[PDB]
Amino acid sequence: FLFSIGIDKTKALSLLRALTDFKRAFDLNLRVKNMLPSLYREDPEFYENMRIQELAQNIHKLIVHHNLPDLMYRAFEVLPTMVMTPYAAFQKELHGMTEEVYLDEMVGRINANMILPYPPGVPLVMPGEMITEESRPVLEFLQMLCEIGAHYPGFETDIHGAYRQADGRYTVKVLKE
Amino acid sequence: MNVIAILNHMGVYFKEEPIRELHRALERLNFQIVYPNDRDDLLKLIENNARLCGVIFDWDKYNLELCEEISKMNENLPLYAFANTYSTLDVSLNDLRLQISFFEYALGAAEDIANKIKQTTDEYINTILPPLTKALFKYVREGKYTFCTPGHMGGTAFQKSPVGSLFYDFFGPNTMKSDISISVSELGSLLDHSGPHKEAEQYIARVFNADRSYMVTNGTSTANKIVGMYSAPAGSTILIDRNCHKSLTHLMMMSDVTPIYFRPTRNAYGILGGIPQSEFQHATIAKRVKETPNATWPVHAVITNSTYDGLLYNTDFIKKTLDVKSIHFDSAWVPYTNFSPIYEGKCGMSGGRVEGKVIYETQSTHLLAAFSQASMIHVKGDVNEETFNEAYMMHTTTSPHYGIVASTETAAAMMKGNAGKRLINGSIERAIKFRKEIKRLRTESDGWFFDVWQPDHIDTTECWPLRSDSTWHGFKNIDNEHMYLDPIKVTLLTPGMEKDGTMSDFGIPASIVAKYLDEHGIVVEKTGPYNLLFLFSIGIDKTKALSLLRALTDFKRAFDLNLRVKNMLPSLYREDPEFYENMRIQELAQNIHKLIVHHNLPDLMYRAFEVLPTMVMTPYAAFQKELHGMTEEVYLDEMVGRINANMILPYPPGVPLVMPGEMITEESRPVLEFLQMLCEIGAHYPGFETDIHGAYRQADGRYTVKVLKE
Amino acid sequence: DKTALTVIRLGGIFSRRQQYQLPVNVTASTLTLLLQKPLKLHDMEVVHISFERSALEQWLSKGGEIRGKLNGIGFAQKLNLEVDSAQHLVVRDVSLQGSTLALPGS
């Protein structure tokens, strides 16, 4: 929260009160139907009987189980291998020499686009870089994100540079051979 | 939007009293009632006032006299029809498509009828407004996000500050609140082309007859670079109109490309003519590829269609003839071609795809009405969407202005449909009227007057063809059925040159007419040595036409009295009282004209631009040296035999004279002679200085240019 | 049934919903494709259709019309072919009856 010159007594009270109201409403375990009506309308049947604490538990259990923080930490602690520079790869693109491959097939291939996953919102693979064995945790984090994020409507995976085909598989752009 | 017209006394209480009750009920519901004096006044009110939003009338008294007349003006306008004995559903009505609600005259009905009319008006309003702007207004009304940025918080910080209050006080809350970020996620996304943004693209793409349309918010300067960088690979050769925009030079410096130039023709006046048909034909291009050092077959061509002075190409011929895979019509001057049939076969988008080629128009929306920087890229053919979209996203502003985007969308909303068709039709009609008005005043006055530069008769309403058998245009050996004059672009001629391009003894340089109009706040669209241009837009009304027309007769009157510069040009006088104390307007004109006559300016200017400096290295090659800081200055006099570092852009005539990497030699000595001549002719009168971009006037009065170091 | 044929979606920036063959899985210059439901095409029953892989590529990208020799033999006949929602290739007969295409066994 940023305390700007905008923020007055009315806004501070509304925020402060809104925070105590979240706790109050959470602890009563209100139905998602009642506490999150707009979310409910997205899938009435999916959300009909779910209570706010159950939504929290299920997503948290996923995080706990998939050990998300450790996997995320490790994905960004090593660097993919720079096979060519981003500029060098762009020369190939300038001539239209790109194809798509599936995410599963990307080890040993030269990436054409930046791959920017959310979370944590910073570049993972640059154009011209390649996942190897030295940098396998990169691919493992990516596959893990696709799995953990496939469970709840409204909590989808989000990786820029990967293209979700209408069939639910992911592709990436690579340099042609 | 609250003016309701009522048109009537009927002679019976059973009709008059309910209308009284309804008048009063409607006034209480916040409608302003207006009362046209008669049927014709009502039609003029509607015709001139878009804020009139409903008409109440007796069905029998008026339906056969009004219904069709109103439907011709506006087919959504609410009509509230009151019935009598004979009022009913006659078979004659069955076939008309009308928006009609039938109501009876009754006391106490206004509350419910008003609520229905309100709802029905909102339904009509909701249909016509574009959905993104509609959603934006709804947010401003309902939303409650506090503890938020922007830091100014809907302009709040401006109000506690007299200095900030000056900016806020003028614009106000709504303007301040419409500056929003992606935090308002329900408006979709420009970058994904989703939601109301898609709806806009389809709307535009369908309206403008394109396969695909992008909304660009940094002008055609930016549209060119998005198309350019996608289109012009390194090491390739491009065909480029020597008549090119600077932003394409900036592209050449950034991309390793070799230019071969399409060569326009030019006449003695200096008016550009079209690239002849020969320049597009395979045999001609092949020959230049042979003659150009390191040239290969061109991968990208850029043609300016139309030319400024209204010469349009047979684009059917070009698309069929030019053997280049990628053709970009920079069509900044012809954004309106889809809306008059007179432009069929004469614009980029006309017809269907061109098999085997991508065709572009880039257009400067801001000869229409739109905010500055608004530009469109219209694509006719396929691109690599992922690489094109990456190219777009790389060159997108840091913080897009949410109004600019709506201003381009609302500019279309204004011009849409019939009423926007009738507006442009009206301007064409008045253009021809004014053209004949100048001819009238030419007759009425004794002695010299303005003339119009046009055909002898204009019995036809079209873009008049320029023909080789006609002398009025002054171009030599012109192609026939090639160029056409846009009626709405009116060029006027001032005394000073003959119909030959030869010089008169008596002249009034147009620059002096500009100074006069400038004292009176009237701007001349475009001026040349002896020419002035006026655009008859949808802005221009009877008051402005009279003020201009009268201002022109006042110039003549004041000129012929030979008023003192002191009296006719007081602001100019204040610049040098002593210099101007005794000078009269005719003497100022004589002296400057005599300079032009003596220095033979038109011949020297013509010749400077008819040869080309020698390309020693490419602009890109010279920029590599600049990139390392390897530039020095030399004086203008010392420039023959040196490699120029900067573009040299002189005024007049306002087009590039020397490029980076070019060198003046003996073959191109007239270049230097013109430049030295400009420095001399322009050193005489305060306020009439020389102006050459790329040359630097040192505090001592000498000129320098930047060159490559040895 | 052992096989189908799942055409991989290709993104990027293009006017159509472009499609792509399997990278190297299928690289046969002319590959034959069997059909789960044999159909009556050109007055004969057909169990397999052979395509020039090159011609199948450009049709998966640009669309248009595509020929294929019925039961591997004879002339390359025009075909009512479409990309399925399940990402398969479906051939239709004059009754508009569909059939999924599969790549042959090891």
From Swiss-Prot, chain A:
Superkingdom of the organism of origin: Bacteria
Induction note: Part of the cadB-cadA operon, which is under the control of the Pcad promoter. Expression is regulated by CadC. Induction occurs under conditions of low pH with excess lysine and anaerobiosis. The global regulator Lrp also has a positive effect on the expression of the cadBA operon when cells are exposed to moderate acidic stress in the presence of lysine. Repressed by H-NS under non-inducing conditions.
Signal peptide: none
Location of this chain's protein in the cell: Cytoplasm
Function description: Inducible lysine decarboxylase that catalyzes the proton-dependent decarboxylation of L-lysine to produce the polyamine cadaverine and carbon dioxide. Plays a role in pH homeostasis by consuming protons and neutralizing the acidic by-products of carbohydrate fermentation.
Self-association state and partner proteins as the record states: Homodecamer; built of five dimers associated in a 5-fold symmetrical double-ring. Interacts (via C-terminus) with RavA.
Family membership noted in the UniProt record: Belongs to the Orn/Lys/Arg decarboxylase class-I family.
Protein's UniProt name: Inducible lysine decarboxylase
Organism: Escherichia coli (strain K12)
Residue numbers of the full-length protein present here: 535 to 711 of 715
Curated annotation (Swiss-Prot), chain C:
GO terms for cellular component: cytoplasm; cytosol
Record's note on what induces expression: Part of the ravA-viaA operon, which is under the direct control of sigma S in aerobically grown cells. In cells grown under oxygen-limiting conditions, expression is largely dependent on the anaerobic transcriptional regulator Fnr. The operon is coexpressed with multiple anaerobic respiratory genes, many of which are regulated by Fnr. Levels increase toward late log/early stationary phase.
Domain of life: Bacteria
Consequences of knocking out this gene: The double ravA-viaA deletion mutant shows increased persistence when grown in the presence of fumarate and kanamycin.
Region (LARA): 1-106
Gene Ontology MF terms in the entry: ATP binding; ATP hydrolysis activity; identical protein binding
Record bears the keyword Cell inner membrane: yes
Major localization listed first in the record, in broad terms: cytoplasm
Cystine bridges: none
Job of this protein: Component of the RavA-ViaA chaperone complex, which may act on the membrane to optimize the function of some of the respiratory chains. RavA functions as an ATPase.
UniProt record similarity statement: Belongs to the RavA family.
Subunit structure: Homohexamer. Interacts with ViaA. Interacts with specific subunits of the NADH-quinone oxidoreductase complex (NDH-1 or Nuo complex), particularly with NuoA and NuoF under aerobic conditions, and with the fused NuoCD under anaerobic conditions. Interacts strongly with the inducible lysine decarboxylase CadA/LdcI, forming a large cage-like structure composed of two CadA/LdcI decamers and five RavA hexamers. Does not interact with the constitutive lysine decarboxylase LdcC. Interactions with ViaA or CadA/LdcI and phosphatidylglycerol are mutually exclusive.
Domain writeup: A protomer can be divided into three domains: the N-terminal domain is the AAA+ module, which is composed of two subdomains, the alpha-beta-alpha subdomain and the all-alpha subdomain. The second domain is a discontinuous triple-helical domain. The third domain, named the LARA domain, contains a compact antiparallel beta-barrel-like domain forming a unique fold. Binding between ViaA and the triple-helical bundle domain of RavA results in the enhancement of the ATPase activity of RavA. The LARA domain mediates RavA-CadA/LdcI interactions.
Official protein name in the record: Regulatory ATPase RavA
Organism annotation: Escherichia coli (strain K12)
First and last residues shown, out of full length: 332 to 437 of 498
